[PDB]
């Protein structure tokens, strides 16, 4: 019904080509009913730093979000601060001041193609996310076990219904259907 979904996009140097990542967003978002009283969406991108592409309450319509999403530019990154990205989506994106609706389910979708440089506090961050009831769906572009394990751990139990594997940027799309319904 009503969920506040924050998408955490990896935009580090390694991600390529950006267009595939955005197509992934399009397909995913277009299947949704966005609205102040519907599904809300906010997008966060990370690399060396983190930036709030757009807040949870920025757009009141699905096309407004669909259009804003496609306008997102890759900011690159010599590092992959996955930990920072998720923590930022948690401590910031999900605050009432940025459109976090009171008492509404909080859902986070993470997409990345590399071992975070902040492996250390990824444990802590995912932890804080659990304490705050944030459903987490993670996706790993394998374009590998130590990596796959890192990402699955970012997902919520049951790992299997919250984790997605992809061969490369391109195949991301071939998951939006399952991802979409899994988050239902």
């Amino acid at each position: 019904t009503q969920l506040d979904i924050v998408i955490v996009l990896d935009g580090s140097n390694s991600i390529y080509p950006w267009e595939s990542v955005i197509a992934f967003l399009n397909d995913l978002l277009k299947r949704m009913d966005i609205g102040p009283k519907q599904t809300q969406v906010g997008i966060v991108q990370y690399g060396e730093n983190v930036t709030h592409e757009f807040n949870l309450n920025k757009y009141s319509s699905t096309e407004e979000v669909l259009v804003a999403a496609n306008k997102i530019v890759q900011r690159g990154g010599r590092q992959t601060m996955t930990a920072l990205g998720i923590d930022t989506a948690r401590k910031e994106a999900f605050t009432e001041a940025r459109g976090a609706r009171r008492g509404v389910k909080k859902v986070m979708v993470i997409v990345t193609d590399g071992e975070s440089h902040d492996n250390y506090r990824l444990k802590q961050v995912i932890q804080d996310c659990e304490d705050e009831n944030i459903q987490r769906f993670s996706i790993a572009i394998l374009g590998t076990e130590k990596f796959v394990e890192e990402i699955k751990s970012i997902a919520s139990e049951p790992t299997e219904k919250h984790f997605f594997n992809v061969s490369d940027e391109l195949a991301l799309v071939t998951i939006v259907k399952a991802l979409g319904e899994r988050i239902f």
Partner: T-cell receptor, first 109, second 106 residues
Framework: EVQLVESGGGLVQPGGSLRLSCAAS????????MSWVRQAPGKGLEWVAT?????????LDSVKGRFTISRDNSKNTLYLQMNSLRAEDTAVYYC???FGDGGYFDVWG | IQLTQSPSSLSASVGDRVTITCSAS?????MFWYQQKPGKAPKPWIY???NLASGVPSRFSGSGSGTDYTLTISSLQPEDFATYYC?????????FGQGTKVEIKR
């Protein structure tokens, strides 16, 4: 195998310029973030600049604004335009393919 | 982040066990190593801390975490004689250590 073949080195006068090119072959060049690394006479290794598969360029402070890293995926050649060269700049330069966000130097010229 | 290797120089005879230490001013998730032989360009030797490049003979091994990392040659060979550099990618600018030169003690 894979490889980078550099050319463009030489002698320039303090404050002048020059341009190194590096021909890539053996891999899908466009996807990797490439870099330039230098080694001064009797010195170690120094990261000069980097350009991602998407066009983001990065630079060591000392060469910031004096150097320009670019690429032309049409001809899988990487470039390092160097202007306002100073003495500190003298060294042997290596283009380099990177792994991941490019910090690991996969292949060298 | 600054990387300082030790020793900076070391002489050893074939068969000796060598261990280069790379200390970083700040902690990092991994460390990389390059092997440069005189007159040639550096060569990827050990990535992601312990992973050996493609050519690197199995006698080579890398290890570490936080601020202290290490490259080890269990059985020094007359061919392993070159200078090794550790490098980090966790902080900007990316940096190398001063390098550690290893010559054949005969």
């Amino acid at each position: 195998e894979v490889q980078l073949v550099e050319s463009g080195g030489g002698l320039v006068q303090p404050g002048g310029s020059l341009r190194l090119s590096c021909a890539a072959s053996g891999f899908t060049f466009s996807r990797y973030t490439m870099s330039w690394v230098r080694q001064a006479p009797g010195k170690g290794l120094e990261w000069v600049a980097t350009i991602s598969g998407g066009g983001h360029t990065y630079y060591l402070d000392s060469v910031k604004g004096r150097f320009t890293i670019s690429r032309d995926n049409s001809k899988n050649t990487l470039y390092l335009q160097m202007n306002s060269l100073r003495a500190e700049d003298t060294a042997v330069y290596y283009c380099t393919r990177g792994f991941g966000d490019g910090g690991y130097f996969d292949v060298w010229g | 982040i600054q990387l300082t290797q030790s020793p900076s120089s070391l002489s050893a005879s074939v068969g000796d066990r060598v261990t280069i230490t790379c200390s970083a001013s700040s902690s990092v998730n991994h460390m990389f190593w390059y092997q440069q032989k005189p007159g040639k360009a550096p060569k990827p030797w050990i990535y992601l801390t312990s992973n050996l490049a493609s050519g690197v003979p199995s006698r080579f091994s890398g290890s570490g975490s936080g601020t202290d990392y290490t490259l080890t040659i269990s059985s020094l060979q007359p061919e392993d004689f070159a200078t090794y550099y550790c490098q980090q990618w966790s902080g900007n600018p990316w940096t190398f250590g001063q390098g550690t030169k290893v010559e054949i003690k005969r």
